[PDB]
Paper text:
The [name] protein PfEMP1([name] [name]), expressed on the surface of IEs in a mutually exclusive manner, is responsible for the sequestration of IEs in various organs. It has been well established that in the case of PM, the PfEMP1 member [name] binds to low sulfated chondroitin sulfate A (CSA) or chondroitin sulfate proteoglycan (CSPG) expressed on placental intervillous tissue to mediate sequestration of IEs in the placenta.
In order to understand this observation, we used cryo-EM to derive a 3.6 Å map of an [name]-[name] complex, which reveals that [name] is sandwiched between two molecules of [name]. Our structure also shows that DBL3X and DBL5ε directly interact with the Cµ4 of [name], possibly leading to the steric hinderance in [name] interaction with its receptor. Further from the overall view of the interacting surface, we observed interaction between chains E, G and K of [name] with I chain of [name] and chains F, D and B chain of [name] with M chain of [name]. Also, chain E of [name] interacts with DBL3x, chain G of [name] interacts with both DBL3x and DBL5ε and chain K of [name] interacts with DBL5ε. Similarly, chain F of [name] interacts with DBL3x, chain D of [name] with DBL3x and DBL5ε and B of [name] with DBL5ε, suggesting very similar interactions on both faces. We observed that although they have an overall RMSD of 1.367 Å, both structures align well between the ID2 to ID3 domain but have major changes and movement of corresponding residues in the DBL5ε domain. However, Ala2280 that is distant from the interacting surface showed a large movement of 55.8 Å away from ID3, reflecting the huge shifts in the C-terminal domains of [name] and also suggesting that the regions away from [name] shift more than the region that are closer to the interfacing surface. This results in the formation of a closed architecture in C-terminus of [name] in the IgMVAR2CSA map that differs from the apo-[name] architecture. The clockwise and anti-clockwise rotation of the two [name] molecules on opposite faces of [name] juxtaposes C-termini of both [name] near the J chain, where [name] creates a wall between both [name] molecules and hinders its interaction with its receptor.
Author numbering:
A (entry chain J): 3 to 69, 98 to 136
B (entry chain A): 445 to 576
C (entry chain L): 449 to 520, 522 to 576
D (entry chain K): 464 to 576
The structure:
């Protein structure tokens, strides 16, 4: 029986715990904590604005996230800007899509 | 009038490192591939500032070998090497009816181009945590 | 007048190895004024009064105004599943007079971690 | 511990008959003043009729607790063969807590969420 404590996807962490029943021994059951993280390795300090430097120093407080510039993107949430593209005579002041398959309307 | 609006894929290629040895100039390019139909407008923005059209020359679409329906084209810009030595990233825009937004943007500079050094200094602490 | 503090103390292993019983407590302290209620809840059903003993709000030597109290037994082979033995505290100086905290058998000191973290370039969207 | 202001240590005595036990705290060879600790009065046990239980609470700052110290709890009752027993604590009284940390670097290797 694995119990998921927090699955905060902004930091992309899957903190979760399990109990392991031992052999024919007194029931002083052990406690285990599997942790797995994901780092973009290619993103920047600001995940949306294309001006911040590259991600160099990473901080993972395993208590703060369980309640704030979260590193990885999300399945649906994203930030996007607007270009001055005109597209010839027919003016096209069109909103853009910074993240493909993630900035789609939802 | 009979062509599917396939997703116009856009890629950015930076000047080769060997070109940055004689300290003469550089050459960025953006290529669009796998789309239909033709008549796609492409240009570069420099931190939101429009770039002079004469500074760059784009290509004309031609049929793709593998897929006759798909087309592709190139856009090439030439800049000085010290401009990249100072950073000064740019972005290449697309104008094709396939995308609902009809526009996509990229970003190319020294940092995003083949980082030879990986300064990873992740910190992990408080393994118990307060998660309740 | 101020914020009570509640903590959980799991039974010591030396008590459990006798294979006879276990004792679980959640200490409440650093609260003012006195007359603070405590209730024991398990699996959503109320716990019978006799199986727990509640102390009185005596003062503590360090903080004069603040008061502290205590509450406390299960069979040895019952806590192995935990059931987390929830205790809720009802104090006047609380948002909703509820500051529930609970700890199960799994909750506690971890013997081992085998923390296996992965990392790769093809990321950035929490795939 | 995680708020870093002070800590409390508790000594539990259980299952004694009759009443009138004695408890105090021994500090590495020297006693402490009585007011630094609070001893709960004897209380009848619910299950066991003749047995009793009691608590002893001692509060001391975290900063000095970061140093080892002994902080021994000593109890005297007639039932004991020598009429006196005691125990001790420390921050090192925990468990080894074996680690099995594994880390993978390659982007080529297949990853799952």
């Amino acid at each position: 029986e694995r119990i998921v404590l927090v699955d905060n996807k902004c930091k992309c962490a899957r903190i979760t715990s399990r109990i392991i029943r031992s052999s024919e021994d007194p029931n002083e059951d052990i406690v285990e904590r599997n942790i797995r993280i994901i780092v973009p390795l290619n993103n920047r300090e600001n995940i949306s604005d294309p001006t911040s430097p590259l991600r160099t120093r990473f901080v993972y407080h395993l208590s703060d996230l369980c309640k704030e510039t979260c590193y990885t993107y999300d399945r649906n949430k994203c930030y996007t800007a607007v270009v001055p593209l005109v597209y010839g005579g027919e003016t096209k002041m069109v909103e853009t899509a910074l993240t493909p398959d993630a900035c789609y309307p939802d | 009038k009979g062509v599917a609006l396939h997703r116009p894929d856009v890629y950015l290629l930076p000047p080769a490192r060997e070109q940055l040895n004689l300290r003469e100039s550089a050459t960025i390019t953006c290529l669009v591939t796998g789309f239909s139909p033709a008549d796609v407008f492409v240009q570069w923005m420099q931190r939101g500032q429009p770039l002079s059209p004469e500074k760059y020359v784009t290509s004309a679409p031609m049929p793709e070998p593998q897929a006759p329906g798909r087309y592709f084209a190139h856009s090439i810009l030439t800049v000085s090497e010290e401009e990249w030595n100072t950073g000064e990233t740019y972005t290449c825009v697309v104008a094709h009816e396939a995308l609902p937004n009809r526009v996509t943007e990229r970003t190319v500079d020294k940092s995003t181009g083949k980082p030879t050094l990986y300064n990873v200094s992740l910190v992990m602490s408080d393994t118990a945590g307060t998660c309740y």
